[PDB]
Amino acid sequence: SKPGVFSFLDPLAYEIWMCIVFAYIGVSVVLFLVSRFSPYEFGIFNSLWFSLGAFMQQGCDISPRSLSGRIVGGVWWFFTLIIISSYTANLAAFLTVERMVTSALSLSNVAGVFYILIGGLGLAMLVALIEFCYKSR
Amino acid sequence: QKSKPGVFSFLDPLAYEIWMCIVFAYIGVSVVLFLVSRFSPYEWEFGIFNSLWFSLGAFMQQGCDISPRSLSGRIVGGVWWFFTLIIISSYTANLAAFLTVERMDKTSALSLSNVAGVFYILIGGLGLAMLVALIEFCYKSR
Amino acid sequence: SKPGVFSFLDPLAYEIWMCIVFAYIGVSVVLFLVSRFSPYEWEFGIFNSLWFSLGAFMQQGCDISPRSLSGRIVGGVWWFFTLIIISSYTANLAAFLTVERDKTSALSLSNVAGVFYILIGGLGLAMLVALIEFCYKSR
Amino acid sequence: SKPGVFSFLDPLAYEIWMCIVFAYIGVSVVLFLVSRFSPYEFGIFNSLWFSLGAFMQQGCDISPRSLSGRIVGGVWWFFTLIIISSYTANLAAFLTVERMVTSALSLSNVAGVFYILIGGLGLAMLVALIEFCYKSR
Amino acid sequence: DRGIQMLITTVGAFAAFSLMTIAVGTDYWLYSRGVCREEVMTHSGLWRTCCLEGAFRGVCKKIDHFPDTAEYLLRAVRASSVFPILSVTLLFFGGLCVAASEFHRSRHSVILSAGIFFVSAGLSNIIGIIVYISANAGSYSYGWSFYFGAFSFIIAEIVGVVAVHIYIEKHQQLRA
Amino acid sequence: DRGIQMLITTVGAFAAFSLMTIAVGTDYWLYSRGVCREEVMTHSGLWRTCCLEGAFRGVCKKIDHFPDTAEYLLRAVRASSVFPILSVTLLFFGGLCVAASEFHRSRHSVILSAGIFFVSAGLSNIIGIIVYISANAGSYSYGWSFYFGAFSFIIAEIVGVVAVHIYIEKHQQLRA
Amino acid sequence: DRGIQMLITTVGAFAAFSLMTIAVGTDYWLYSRGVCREEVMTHSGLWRTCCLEGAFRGVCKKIDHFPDTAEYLLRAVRASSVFPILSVTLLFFGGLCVAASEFHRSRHSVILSAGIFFVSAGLSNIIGIIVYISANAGSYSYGWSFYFGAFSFIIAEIVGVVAVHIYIEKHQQLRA
Amino acid sequence: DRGIQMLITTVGAFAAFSLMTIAVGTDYWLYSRGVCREEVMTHSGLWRTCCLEGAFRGVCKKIDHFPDTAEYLLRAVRASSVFPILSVTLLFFGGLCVAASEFHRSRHSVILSAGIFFVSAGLSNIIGIIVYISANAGSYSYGWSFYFGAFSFIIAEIVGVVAVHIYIEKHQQLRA
Ligand SMILES: CCCCCCCC/C=C/CCCCCCCC(=O)OC[C@H](O)CO
Ligand SMILES: CCCCCCCC/C=C/CCCCCCCC(=O)OC[C@H](O)CO
Ligand SMILES: CCCCCCCC/C=C\CCCCCCCC(=O)OC[C@H](O)CO
Ligand SMILES: CCCCCCCC/C=C\CCCCCCCC(=O)OC[C@H](O)CO
Ligand SMILES: CCCCCCCCCCCCCCCC(=O)O
Ligand SMILES: CCCCCCCCCCCCCCCC(=O)O
Ligand SMILES: CCCCCCCCCCCCCCCC(=O)O
Ligand SMILES: CCCCCCCCCCCCCCCC(=O)O
Secondary structure: OOOOOOHHHOOEOHHHHHHHHHHHHHHHHHHHHHHHOOOOOOOHHHHHHHHHHHHOOOOOOOOOOOHHHHHHHHHHHHHHHHHHHHHHHHHHHHHHHHHHOOOOEOHHHHHHHHHHHHHHHHHHHHHHHHHHHHHHO | OOOOOOOOHHHOOEOHHHHHHHHHHHHHHHHHHHHHHHOOOOOOOOOHHHHHHHHHHHHOOOOOOOOOOOHHHHHHHHHHHHHHHHHHHHHHHHHHHHHHOOOOOOOOOEOHHHOHHHHHHHHHHHHHHHHHHHHHHHHHOO | OOOOOOHHHOOEOHHHHHHHHHHHHHHHHHHHHHHHOOOOOOOOOHHHHHHHHHHHHOOOOOOOOOOOHHHHHHHHHHHHHHHHHHHHHHHHHHHHHHOOOOOOOOEOHHHOHHHHHHHHHHHHHHHHHHHHHHHHHOO | OOOOOOHHHOOEOHHHHHHHHHHHHHHHHHHHHHHHOOOOOOOHHHHHHHHHHHHOOOOOOOOOOOHHHHHHHHHHHHHHHHHHHHHHHHHHHHHHOOOOOOOOEOHHHHHHHHHHHHHHHHHHHHHHHHHHHHHHO | OHHHHHHHHHHHHHHHHHHHHHHHHOOOOEEOEEOOOOOEEEEEOOOEEEEOOOOOOOOEEEOOOOOOHHHHHHHHHHHHOHHHHHHHHHHHHHHHHHHHHHHOOOOOHHHHHHHHHHHHHHHHHHHHHHHHHHHHHOOOEEOHHHHHHHHHHHHHHHHHHHHHHHHHHHHHHHHO | OHHHHHHHHHHHHHHHHHHHHHHHHOOOOEEEEEOOOOOEEEEEOOOEEEEOOOOOOOOEEEOOOOOOHHHHHHHHHHHHOHHHHHHHHHHHHHHHHHHHHOOOOOOOHHHHHHHHHHHHHHHHHHHHHHHHHHHHHOOEEEOHHHHHHHHHHHHHHHHHHHHHHHHHHHHHHHHO | OHHHHHHHHHHHHHHHHHHHHHHHHOOOOEEEEEOOOOOEEEEEOOOEEEEOOOOOOOOEEEOOOOOOHHHHHHHHHHHHOHHHHHHHHHHHHHHHHHHHHOOOOOOOHHHHHHHHHHHHHHHHHHHHHHHHHHHHHOOEEEOHHHHHHHHHHHHHHHHHHHHHHHHHHHHHHHHO | OHHHHHHHHHHHHHHHHHHHHHHHHOOOOEEOEEOOOOOEEEEEOOOEEEEOOOOOOOOEEEOOOOOOHHHHHHHHHHHHOHHHHHHHHHHHHHHHHHHHHHHOOOOOHHHHHHHHHHHHHHHHHHHHHHHHHHHHHOOOEEOHHHHHHHHHHHHHHHHHHHHHHHHHHHHHHHHO
8 A cells, every 4th residue: 555644653652652642741740849849950841852852762851850850860761772773673564574575765664754853843943933022921 | 583682682792601791890890989089088089889980981981080199099990991892883783683693684674672671670760760869859858 | 685875775765865865955045045034144155054964964963053943943854854764764774684585694895885985085076176175166 | 603792793804804993083183174174173183083972973062163174074974974875774684695594693793892891891981090190290 | 831730630630541441341352252141243341241132142151250270360350350440549539639639738748649559550550451352362353342442541640740740830839 | 155055145146046947847757658649759748748869750739648536636726836937936036035125224134034935945956856757657767857857946945044043143143 | 977987888798798799799680582502581690591381490500601892892801791890899898998998097098999999899880880881782580699799899989988088187287 | 303204204105105116016906717728726916816836836927907988998907007007106296296396495385286196096096996906807816916905095195195284384383
């Protein structure tokens, strides 16, 4: 069949994606909570940014310093490593069993990520305009 | 038939001995990084707790808030980086092998049952973190 | 089947590579725009935006991260894009190396020679640009 | 056959490994050179640390700021991404065509990385002692 | 914005509790093809399964939750719905703390404890969802009861964040 | 570089608009085997497909875009080619703002508006390309019309950056 | 915590040494099927293999380590078990340094030496384990002797850290 | 340490040049099984192949080389050994600059240019190695000529870094 727009999600079941989102929220909220009632800048917005960047195995501008922050961060790092490796491994499986049955990936079976990307850029520009107008008045 | 997925089946790509030696290597690296960073009396941020955090983050490929600056620290860091790269690639590669060829070819999406263990460890860690935060609070408030 | 100098591009179609380049430029420009015209603040000029985006795609992390909500949305979707695309590259390369269209060989220098040539070409270009910058700034 | 101690190098040919080492040196030296004769702390040792960390996709304490430094860094990043992906992909190939001819990998076919690790720790301790004695006298 | 913050907290606490209690009560978690006692389209919940069509339509039978330590524990935990119920309990206690805050303004920790209850309720909710889905695995769709549980989780986490902000701002303002 | 910046902006605005309009008009997007009525080599644009060798050489015919809701939406969007046209519209408005900025020196935002329009044109352009490619493949080559679209995107983004720089410099010099 | 630090160091030094010495002595590293002379269940250490059920129950025999240069070196290193023995030696020297440090308060480096010895013992221990595992597999289970080795490693590393902390605190207080 | 730095620079320049020239001259790059004109063990270089045993032993021919734009260019570049020779040339010029430095201390850029030549020589060396290996691909082992080339690369890079450090320290010292 012709690949579907969001076919890049296929390696993991819908329930895994949904639970990833919930785990993301739970981690961000607990990191925020343990950081503000701890002896020794993880507000909620920065907690969400830390967690997002951790899941994408990207940069962190800040890492937790407390023991509780570091426990939260450490388990989220471990979860991320398993889940991303699982995505890659299962995608390799789907593509190897399809080749057994050029096989270069076509724009069509990653088109959804491009649409989400450009949608995000559009949304970002809109939010920038809104925030700017709000700060103007 | 197809063995229904176990909790902790996410550990299956690597033998139990590899996992236990990863944990020992982790401790050894953290302690040597601490040692070669400190006893040098020229300088004395790589205390033991920060050493453990640096090492953990290196293994999870999450990078760092601090990097070693000495030659000894950098040797330790460098070999731990190399070890990490080989081990994680090995995990991904062997998991791909297991998912492609059944050894008790349709290939199905991973189900929540295949990764449920990692979710339980995660939520366990969040619970533990909250408990430790309460304990720290009570200690430091008295 | 002689590998071919630029055979490392084979896992992804030519259209994906060209759209990656366009997405890269678009992301860099929007990150610059939503970081600047906000007159409340005015480090994410255009050159630094391009560097942030390049490092994000190569999964090399950053010297600077966006602090605004708009910058973080842009960064977040670019991070997600990067993750999917790179995983796709690795997965499809695993497919081609597993099934020929049965033993598996180690990759030979011929399979990755193109990447070496691009690397050494970049080093040569960098040295040339350094000389030019030096001569410009010294007069 | 029983796996060899350095069997973890098998996915890439010996010539690739050797050229990776040479490319590493060449990159580090050019980064150092373009950084010291550029208008606008990459001395030779920091250049060699930046490059090592880039190849291991383990981030950095410092990134180049000049155009020439960023070109060098960019091509080294690209090279790294292709080479690491190639390693993982070919290792997946070797392990799949074996399962098609214990599921889990054994300590024996990663034993070499453990030996290199502990060797490096020993060497690090030795260098620390040497440097300490040198700075003492 | 303390008035509005408290308004959001109270409304959200009530919303989370209502959604979670309805979800635990109602029987539209899963649309599958089982039997109320031939297989027909059903609609199961946490406790009962019911027929969606045909003669026995509207007839519901207690789920035989039961027909390997791990399988046993999962089946036990899913049978009793420990975690959905625990999340309902914690939401109730969080609501009690939020209500009690106004009637006792001397002590600060009341609203903080509200926040902590809500956060904990969300965590229990997550564990419940995972257990439920995993136990089912051992075609289909999810009903509106399932999504009521999910929305309860989201709202609970939001209310927890707002409660902790109230406590933080009280201590920040008073201390300085 | 103020004068030079404005010159680059104006020339670039015109160049981007011209390239994109030509691309949307001309019929050399794709080189493929088909029939404009055995199938011969042809060339297609967004609207017409035309044979370039044979008895019917130089003949053209309207593409039948409509010979799976996602497939339907893709077919609709690619049939209207709303995105290339929207890119041309936004380039037109950006050019108009650049022209107007020369008059209303009092209001800075005019040139900023130009900037934004150009940036947005670039985004719509990229969507266009993806949709186009995604719909076609659902051998061949790309003609000069396609590359005119691509170069339009690049120039549009460059001009957007330069325009925003002009506005930034205005609001910086004003502060000085 | 100075007194407590030294108490932990001394107790830990003794514990690590005792555990590692017992582990190297006792014969419950591996549980596997073999013959100490059909093959019965047995238990092996570093040197002796002994049957634990059958006619010859309680019988023991020297392992034949030597029944491919890398294989030869592995066999050699695992036959001598140089690394577990070296770990015991270094733990002994570390303990001796800890005892001596109580006397020569003038020379700080004594306790630092203790630290280093313990750390080094840990490393040799890990090499031992890897060599052991690598050689064996070239079903089964691990006995309490193996886990004594593992716990020795952990305690050795902890005591090394504490010793280095003592030395650091000495050179810090001295500077004050 | 300027005296020692200059000593290292001169000795290293000579060593790199000697090693690279020998490598480009000698004929022990590759041990394979070809023919000097049955297949026997040979020992090829950049220009000639020779028999290592049997009757025709000591007899050397010329590598055919020439016996698909990419394949053509690779074969051309490898046939002429452009890059090894270019690396020899650049090492020669670097040595000339290093020698000329002392006889003309007025101008600084001389040693800087020495460093740049050496760095460039190393890069050419790398390209040569890659081209050579890749061209061979289109059992075997590498001889001592190959490793002479490799060591030339390493030394060239180390001399380049020392030369640049001489220049940097001269400008740093004089400027301040
Ligand atoms: C410095 C602060 C660090 C604190 C944060 C570090 C967290 C990182 C690691 C988490 C995984 C740990 C748990 C690993 C899971 C063990 C599961 C297990 O043992 O399973 C037994 C097996 O399934 C029998 O059949
Ligand atoms: C801001 C500073 C950034 C500057 C540094 C960024 C470097 C990153 C990218 C390098 C790869 C670029 C070259 C990609 C290789 C193209 C090869 C190609 O087009 O091949 C044609 C094909 O093989 C026909 O058959
Ligand atoms: C910047 C300061 C310097 C940083 C510090 C340096 C750390 C290097 C880390 C990892 C690479 C080294 C590990 C790889 C060693 C190779 C092992 C090997 O060669 O084994 C194969 C053998 O040849 C059988 O063929
Ligand atoms: C504090 C941080 C602020 C947050 C910054 C925002 C960036 C979040 C990043 C990426 C996720 C977006 C990608 C996921 C898009 C969801 C749509 C989707 O996958 O569609 C599937 C479709 O429903 C078929 O069934
Ligand atoms: C930090 C974690 C957040 C990561 C964001 C990843 C994006 C998740 C998208 C999940 C959407 C769920 C839809 C499933 C797809 C389907 O079944 O068709
Ligand atoms: C650097 C630390 C990374 C985290 C490593 C996780 C350790 C997992 C648990 C190790 C113990 C043994 C687990 C394997 C048991 C089995 O299923 O056979
Ligand atoms: C974010 C920038 C990452 C670098 C991306 C590399 C781009 C490679 C070159 C793109 C042009 C087309 C290459 C494919 C040609 C082909 O072989 O068909
Ligand atoms: C930053 C780049 C450096 C990365 C270090 C990776 C280690 C390279 C090791 C190469 C050794 C060459 C031996 C090849 C193995 C063999 O053929 O048996």
